[model samples]
Target chain A: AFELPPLPYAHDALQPHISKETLEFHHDKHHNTYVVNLNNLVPGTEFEGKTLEEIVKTSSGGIFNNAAQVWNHTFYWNCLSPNAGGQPTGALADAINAAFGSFDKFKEEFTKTSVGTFGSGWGWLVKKADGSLALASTIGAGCPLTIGDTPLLTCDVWEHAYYIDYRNLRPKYVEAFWNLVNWAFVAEQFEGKTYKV
Target chain B: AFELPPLPYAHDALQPHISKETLEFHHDKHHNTYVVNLNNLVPGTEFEGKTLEEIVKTSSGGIFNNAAQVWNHTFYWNCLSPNAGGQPTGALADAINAAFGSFDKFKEEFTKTSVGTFGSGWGWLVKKADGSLALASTIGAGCPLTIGDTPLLTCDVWEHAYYIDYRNLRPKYVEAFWNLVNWAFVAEQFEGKTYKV
Candidate 1:
């Protein structure tokens, strides 16, 4: 069975953008629950011998939900850093410009996509098979990997992601997210790096 | 235009179970936003003159989301009371007993349905057209009305409904909900009384 990974930084590192209380619940409780659930579900099941990614790609229903969520939460943690954000640079920056006009335009589009996402889900930046950047919104346990896209960056729009910090003002939470995005991590993903779960 | 209704009781009335802070964001911010959104969405649209119920039944996309949410939040308020809970009496009680064998069993099942609901939705006790009692979980802005069922009771399972008071422990929030179910209002609905949205 898989384990819940430690936060990339201290619990309060992303504050006052994301509160320490939020991380305590989001990571410690919510993320850990998914890990525990996946582990409990995998034993004595078809997914018992499969890697998290393999199960995520092949399973359905509860197994898929738990597996994809475990993977998603880990990726989400890596997507943020205490002092990151502003804009990307180098080839990733140029690719974003080519896709969405400029960095400001890309930011605006991504924020809108994240804020407008309807329910418990994530808003994503992913690279298409043809190497173009695009935005996507996935409901519940939906993920880019399930749809053949390479995920670059993701901003969780799940109410649990921002409720402790921003309450019902999701737009404000999305705004705060711009201050804490880890461009280095996202850039690596854009350059064909994949995460292990 | 639709307006946010006043909570049936004081903000702190359901306290210790559902905290006052929870209602502040739930009714004042979260529920109010649905009203504001529905109003904004209707002004220049074909739904300008339609009732909230009409809009919920006939519309799709943002209009339906907002209208149904407006209707759902109001119903949720009525489903709760300061000192309510335990179980229903009269024919409603008999119906529930007939449907689920006993009140204890029904409570167990409803709690399971609510806690097991995936994300951003509601758990419901509804009356089928043939008058059988049933449990349902609706995602996002889903409503029983849209599907030809009469809602008897609802517990908002959206994260905003419980995150403040219970954090990520939704099962605890749902347990607290059992302490505040307004059986009188639910019984009225069971006896064929419909609410104004």
Candidate 2:
């Protein structure tokens, strides 16, 4: 059974950028429920003892929904930090500029993709098979891992991700997200680190 | 071009069941944006001269998303009332009882469908072509209209629909919804009235 990963920082650490109330419900309620459901769903199934990643990759329906959500939430927590944000440095910067022409252009593209994603989904920065960087949007518990892309960074656009803090103003939530992005964690993923829950 | 409809009742009418704050954002912000997007997306496209219903039935992609949402929101508002919530009292009541064995069973089935819907979607009580009532869960911008079912009632299970008041407790939001359901509107739809936005 998968376990919910604790937030890397205190619930209030993200502060004005992402509220304490938002983190409590998002992490304690929403993410915990996904972990709980995944544990309950895996019994008596082929995915019973499979890793969260394997279940996300191979299963469908309820098992896949819960498994992928558990994985996505864990990765999302790592993607944020109290002392993070600003542009990546060194090789990660070079790769982003090379793929999208410049960091500003990359921000423009990533933010647009995140804001324009329709409904409960994620906007992702992913490293493709050919060593290229690109943007992806997956609806409802979708993970880039299932499609063979190595996820570099992600912005959860699920209404639950922002509704508590920003109400229906998703664009505002996406904008504030930049202030807390854990670029070091994103850079590690860009350098081919795989996260497991 | 499409237009946003005003809420059928005062924002505060639903009271402690669904809050004024929820209606303010759900209707004024979220629902209005869909109508705005529909108008902007329609010009100079193949959908330029189509009705909201036609665009919902015939188009896909952004046009369909905005158009169907415009239709869905309007219908959803009519499904609620300030002085509503008791069981229906006519042919509609008989139909529901016949279909689900009793009014209580029908409420159980519908509430479960609404609560169990994953991500951004709607749970519906629709009149099937065969004259039987059935429950439906449609993802994102989905509508029963496109699939030839007469949408008798809908519960907007999108987090934005309830997050302001209910936070992550969708089941509680859904439970409160029963107190405001305008059964007359649902019964009218069941009697072959189609709403146009």
Candidate 3:
């Protein structure tokens, strides 16, 4: 049976930036429900023993909604930290600057995409096979990892993620999200194949 | 310039069923925005002199989104009454019976449709040109008016409509909405022709 992953930080660790209450409900309630639903859906079927990644790649509807949401939410928790955000370092900086010109331009593009996504999904920075990065917004339990893109960073725009904290000012939540972004974690995820040559 | 209609009842009128706080935000803020957005979107072009109905029938994208939401929300407000629900007792009942067999069946289908609607949207009971009452659910600013159907009643299934009162339990919200349904108003809207001769 699949299990719920503990949040990367204590419930209050991301506080003021992302509230303890928000993290508790979003993780304990929403994310955990998806995990439970996916478990029930995958048992005693053709999908009985499929890995999460395999289920996400092949299924659709209820099974897919549950599986993909589990993955998206797990990734969302990892994308935040008590100490991070604002510009990248190491080879990740070189990759971002090379693909998007400069860090400021990248922030501008990412901010716009995050704010503009219609509803209940995520805005991600993903790496294609050629090691270049691109922005992707997937609606309703969608994830970039479903295809072949390697997800580097993600901002979940679902209302439950920010409502207890940000309410209807989604852009405000998205704005504050920058201060807590785990660029370090993102750097670790940015390892898609192929050289620039 | 297009305008926002005043609430048909006081903010607190529908208490215990739908709260004053929910009405204040759902009506005064969310619904009003669509009116403002529709006004802003339609004033400089072909939609300027068009009725909300006309705009819904003709536009697409932002224009369609705003126009249809305005109309759907307005009708939704009219469909609620502080002292109503249970079942209807008129030609409306006759129409519902003829189309869906019995009131229980219509309620069953309507409840199922509303509960099953994914994400943000509405569940509507509408009268087709053939005088049949059919239930429809539309996603993301969609409205039945677009297809020339006469919308008889609607339940706003958008999270904002019920979040303050129902939170994640959308089924509870839908259940309560049934108790507040204004059968009289629905009966008024239930007009269709071309019945089987």
Candidate 4:
């Protein structure tokens, strides 16, 4: 069984916006359940004992979904930090400025996408097939991974991720999510990574 | 410019479920905006004078979005009737039974899809390239059309369609929608008479 990932920070660290209760349920219960299910579903098969990325590259459909959910959840947890959010300040910031024109424009587009994404899905900033970074949204699990893009950052727009704090007011959740984004980690993913066909 | 199609029946006719107010805004205002925007965007262009189906066939992407929004909204309005819903009879029913095992099972799957679809999109019963009907959902105005399938029946799951009555409770809206599904019309579409490829 895949081990439950440790949160990069405390549960209450992202509070006042994303509550400690929300993180507990989102990380411990929901994410852990996906990890456990994936391990059970793939044991002794070709996917057995493979790294999460290896499993994602091999199995697709339900197996990929469960595995990617495990990977995505872990990355999602680490993608936020207590002192994160606002804007990026390095090569990632430079790329965003060049590709989208400006940081304000990037945030505007990304927030619009996050708020606009339907039902249970994710809003992502990904390296495209053309080596440019762009904002995209996907419904349910493994949408980006299945399409072969390198996901740099993501915001979970699923109601379970924000419903306790924002209720049906998703725009508020989206706005606050910016304050918790770990730009340093996202920059690491983008730096020196070329687009993969 | 394509005018917004009027509801075939009077407003409030599909009562105890979908109210007249909902239809008024959904059909007149919302659908009309798409028609107007499509016309404005494509006027005097090669796509300007084509029928909705033709626009859907070619010029997809954003242009197709505007055109298909007009088509989808019109079809969505026609797919309902005051005395509709309950059980579908004839070939459509038979196909549902064959594909999904039974009417209840089909409804269960279809409703699950409708509920599960994330944001401003639609759940469809479509005729696949293989001549089989399948339940699918599209995220936004132009998605399903771009994917090359003939839409048989559709349900709009956008919050605007149900928020006044159902609030954020989408499942309730989806259940109530069954009370007004124009099975006869859907069956005719299933028989392949609505549009030419």
Candidate 5:
């Protein structure tokens, strides 16, 4: 049973930036739907015993939609925390500086990626083989893992992600998203190395 | 400065099926954003001073997103009435019957189209050169006119259209949407003649 992960912080922790109500609906309702749909879809199929990531890599159509969404939502929850973001320190910060010339530039580029995505999607900061980070964006339930990129962090751009808080101003929601990044989680996912891909 | 067209009826006209609050937000907030975005996007460009239809036909990218949304939403408003649906009659009925075998069958097809749309989108019943009607669906701000289909009627399948009224239960929203379809407007858009591609 693919279950909706518990929110890492209390629902109210991100108030004003992301409200208790928004998190409740987004995580408890929306993400829960993906979780249940994936469960229902995986059973009695080629995907029955496959890992969620395996299903994500091998499935298509409804199965892919549900699986990818489930995976993305879980990643999204971990990417956010109360008082989580500011500036990365140590190697992550140096890598950020090296990749985009400065941490502020990385934030701007990632925000542009998140804000400019035209539909329901995700914006990613991923680690390439050589330890550099690349900004990526995916449409609908797209997954970077499907294309061999190990995503270090993501910001969901789905309207459901920010509608209750920011409505049609995706840029504002993206601004809040940057300020809430859980850099510790992201750094853990990174190999801390650099290269040519 | 482009302006939002006043909704054709009092906001509460489509009650029980659709509410004043839904129309106010969907039209005033969501649809209004499209108008404002198109206004911002088209000025001082090649599309400046062009008709909404002209801009929809001639542009792509951000211009297309906002312009097509403006066109689609206007069409959508006219496709709903306080006492709009039940079944089409006369030539419209005959056309529907011929196109999908019966009105019941037509509803089934169009409902599936709307509910099954993978993401933010719309479902349309469009008329062709021939009097036949076919079910159509488009992703994001997709418009059928871009492909030469004259939309006889449309249901905005975008979440903002019904999310406030129905939440995540799209089937319920689609079922209610069918009950509110403006057949008179649909029939007026049809000529009931046939031709080949």
Candidate 6:
């Protein structure tokens, strides 16, 4: 069974960008429900006693979406902070500069890649198959978890994350979100993980 | 050229749930960019001098995403209100009750549909081919605009809409959103449009 992850900061701490009310509903209500549901769905079934990654791998149909979503949402929540975002400052920054030309160029392509995803998917900065970091989008809950790439940073371009705040203005959401990205966390993930590509 | 639509109410009116700060970034920064980009992307070509609907139909790839996103976001903003949500009151209510059994049932299905969507997409309450309402999810900018269905109301389940507030917990966002749904606007669309089915 999944337990609710403690928020990194106060619900309203990320204010002016994200609202406390949105957090109350989104975290206490939404994320909690996933934890409850996943617990209910997994305990008595074939997925009983499986790790999150195992659940993600073995459950291919409806089960995969629910389990992966539960896992993905948990990871996504911890990926941001009140003081995060702006520009990458370390190895992640160096890696991005190397791969996409410059921070500005990388931002342009990454933002475009995220905003360009066709439907319910994610835009990711992953250590690709060649040990190089690249940005990619995945349909639905599809991610490098299944494909073997190491995800460095992710921007969830899903409307639920921004619509109440931005409505249809997705690009703005993409841009403003940069202000809250946890680059240090991403740098750690990128540096620690060994990638096939 | 399209201009940004002003918020229907004051920025602080929806306080607690939606913050003035989020509104500023969500509206001024995010939605405004989509309008500007769409304006730039359209015009001076086959897309020039076309209606939003026309642009959606004729364009493919990026053109479609830009145009459809603009349209979707515009409609999405209006579909919500500080005082919205709760059960529909008229024909929409009746149809939902009849088709899905009851409002609670509808909410369950709608929440599931929205949460169940794989990634960045929308879940819609659309008038289907049979002239009855059905719940559907569209990946990315995918829409039923070209199909016979008339979109009545939509919920954006993308991460950007909820992540800042909800993190990985999307169910709470969907639930609270039920409190703010613009039933009157949806009813007006359903009643005002000429039906094909």
Give the candidate number with the greatest TM-score. Answer: 1
lDDT of 3 by residue, B1-197 (tens): 76778888988888889999888887888788888887778767888787777788899988888888888888888899787888987899998888889998998899899877766778989888887788999887888878888888899887778777877778898889889998888877885331110
Better of 2 and 6 by DockQ: 2
lDDT of 3 by residue, A110-139 (tens): 888887776467888998878788999887
Report, to 2 decimal places, the DockQ of model 3: 0.39
* Model 3: residue A117 alpha-carbon error in angstroms: 2.0
Ordering by DockQ: 2, 1, 5, 3, 6, 4
Which parts of model 3 are misplaced by more than 4 Å? A192-197, B192-197
In model 5, the fraction of reference contacts reproduced equals: 0.22
Indicate the TM-score of model 1: 0.98
CA displacement after TM-score superposition, residue A30 of candidate 5 (Å): 2.0
Candidate 1 has an interface RMSD (Å) of 0.8
In candidate 2, the second chain superimposes onto the true chain B with a TM-score of 0.97
On residues A12-127, what C-alpha lDDT tens digit does candidate 6 reach at each position?
87666766765676567666776777787787789887777778867787667767766666666666789777888777788889999899999899898998876666788888
Report the lDDT tens digits of candidate 5 across residue range B13-56: 99888878888888888889889888889888999878887788
- What are the TM values for chain B, all candidates? 0.98, 0.97, 0.94, 0.94, 0.94, 0.91
How close to the true structure is residue A178 of candidate 6, measured as C-alpha lDDT? 81
**Candidate 2 lDDT over residue span B54-77, tens digit each:** 889999999899888989899999
| Candidate 4: tens digits of C-alpha lDDT, residues B20-51 | 87787778776777788787888778986787
Native-to-model Cα distance after best TM-score fit, residue B158 in candidate 3, in Å:
1.7
Better of 1 and 3 by lDDT: 1
User: Candidate 1's residue-wise lDDT over B1-197, tens digit each?
Assistant: 67889999999999899999999999999999899988888988899888888889999999999899999999999999897887899999999999999999999999988889897889999999998999999999999999889999999999999988888889999999999999999999998667866
Q: Which stretches of candidate 1 lie over 4 Å from their true place?
A: none
Alpha carbon deviation, residue B169, candidate 5 (Å): 2.1
Please identify which of the two predictions, 3 or 4, would achieve the higher DockQ against the true structure.
Answer: 3
Give Cα-based local distance difference scores for all models: 0.91, 0.90, 0.82, 0.79, 0.83, 0.74
lDDT of 6 by residue, B80-158 (tens): 8887666787788899999999989998998888887766678898887677889888877777786757888888765
Q: Taking the tens digit of each residue's C-alpha lDDT, what string does model 2 give over A1-197? A: 57788789999999898899999999999999999998889999899888988999999999899889998899999999998789999888999999999999998999999999889999999999998999998898999999899998999999988888888888899889999999999988988566765
Name the lDDT value of residue A167 in candidate 2: 81
lDDT, candidate 1, residue A178?
90
